[PDB]
Amino acid sequence: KYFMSSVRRMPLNRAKALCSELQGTVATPRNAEENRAIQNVAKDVAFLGITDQRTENVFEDLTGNRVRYTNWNEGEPNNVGSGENCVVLLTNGKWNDVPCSDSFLVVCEFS
Amino acid sequence: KKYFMSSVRRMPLNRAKALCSELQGTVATPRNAEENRAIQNVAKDVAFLGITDQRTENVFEDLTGNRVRYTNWNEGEPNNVGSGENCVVLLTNGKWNDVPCSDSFLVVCEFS
Ligand SMILES: CO[C@H]1O[C@H](CO)[C@@H](O)[C@H](O)[C@@H]1O
Ligand SMILES: CO[C@H]1O[C@H](CO)[C@@H](O)[C@H](O)[C@@H]1O
Ligand SMILES: [Ca+2]
Ligand SMILES: [Ca+2]
Ligand SMILES: [Ca+2]
Ligand SMILES: [Ca+2]
Numbered sequence: 001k002y003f004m005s006s007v008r009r010m011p012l013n014r015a016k017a018l019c020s021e022l023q024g025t026v027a028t029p030r031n032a033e034e035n036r037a038i039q040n041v042a043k044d045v046a047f048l049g050i051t052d053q054r055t056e057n058v059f060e061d062l063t064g065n066r067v068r069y070t071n072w073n074e075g076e077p078n079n080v081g082s083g084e085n086c087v088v089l090l091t092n093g094k095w096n097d098v099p100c101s102d103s104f105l106v107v108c109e110f111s
Numbered sequence: 112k113k114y115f116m117s118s119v120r121r122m123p124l125n126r127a128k129a130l131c132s133e134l135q136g137t138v139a140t141p142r143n144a145e146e147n148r149a150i151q152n153v154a155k156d157v158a159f160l161g162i163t164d165q166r167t168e169n170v171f172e173d174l175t176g177n178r179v180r181y182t183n184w185n186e187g188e189p190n191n192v193g194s195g196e197n198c199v200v201l202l203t204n205g206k207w208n209d210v211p212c213s214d215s216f217l218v219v220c221e222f223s
């Protein structure tokens with residue numbers, strides 16, 4: 001896997017479109033090593049290819065596969081506000097669930 | 112090492128540049144036959160390369176204004192037809208053709 005970060009912020013739909021344009025997908029860390037690599041390429045908070053849109057509190061990657069490795073920040077995921085179904089990697093490498101409509105950088109993953 | 116990725120949609124040069132730079136890459140510029148073939152492997156159809164003679168006609172430079180050495184022009188190219196052809200594309204046989212920068216083609220981005 002190769003990981004690349006965008007320079008501009010955008011919501012999830014636009015983030016998925018960007019990675020897909022170059023035939024990749026929004027980055028999904030499968031272990032601590034990949035999590036660190038994605039954190040490093042990202043200069044600020046960035047979207048990961050994980051959501052619980054299909055079923056609340058059931059986090060899966062963009063292909064529908066349930067995720068095993070997770071690295072939630074303390075108190076997360078909390079689905080606050082009117083709901084948070086997308087996931088971002090914080091600048092400390094931990095994860096926070098956020099609204100898919102909000103804008104963040106995007107880290108794309110390619111094989 | 113360099114990694115090459117191809118776009119799905121066709122777009123003119125300005126948009127090709129914008130796409131690759133969005134992910135901090137550049138439009139693919141083969142520096143030898145190995146790279147040219149690596150770009151061929153990912154490009155399913157005619158695709159833009161990061162080379163132009165926009166500064167001085169017939170003097171081909173990469174997008175950073177650095178004169179290129181390796182070239183793989185198709186027979187008869189570059190020919191600068193019509194109102195001018197200052198951009199370069201990789202044909203499906205791996206040879207190059209100069210084309211209008213405003214015309215749309217797939218884009219291959221380069222990262223390292
Ligand atoms: C956040 O919701 C969007 O993204 C998820 C994950 O790709 C899809 O399941 C859903 O249909 C929407 O397109
Ligand atoms: C007629 O113009 C087209 O074909 C010639 C080759 O025949 C190319 O040089 C040119 O860039 C165009 O693709
Ligand atoms: Ca949720
Ligand atoms: Ca949250
Ligand atoms: Ca020309
Ligand atoms: Ca030509």
Ligand SMILES: [Cl-]
Pocket residue numbers: 083084085086098099100101
């Ligand atoms: Cl949401």
